């Protein structure tokens, strides 16, 4: 759900941390819940 310029796996920088493969998503700025994003 968009509210403040992207929220989850949408407006975030999905073209570096993974770029589709590693999934740019990152629930909560304080790192993801040991899922979605990583490495």
Residue 22 burial by Cβ neighbours in a 10 Å radius (0-12, 13-18, 19+) = middle
State phi, psi for 6 to the nearest 5 degrees. 80, 150
Technique used to solve these coordinates: NMR
Residues 32, 21 contacting (CB under 8 angstroms) = no
* 39 Cα distance to chain centroid: 12
Short-list 25, 28, 20, CA closest to 9: 25
Q: Where exactly are the structural domains of the chain? A: 1-34
């Amino acid at each position: 759900s968009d509210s403040k310029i992207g929220n989850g796996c949408f407006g975030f920088p999905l073209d570096r941390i993974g770029s589709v493969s590693g999934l740019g998503c990152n629930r909560i700025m304080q790192n993801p819940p040991k899922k979605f994003s990583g490495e």
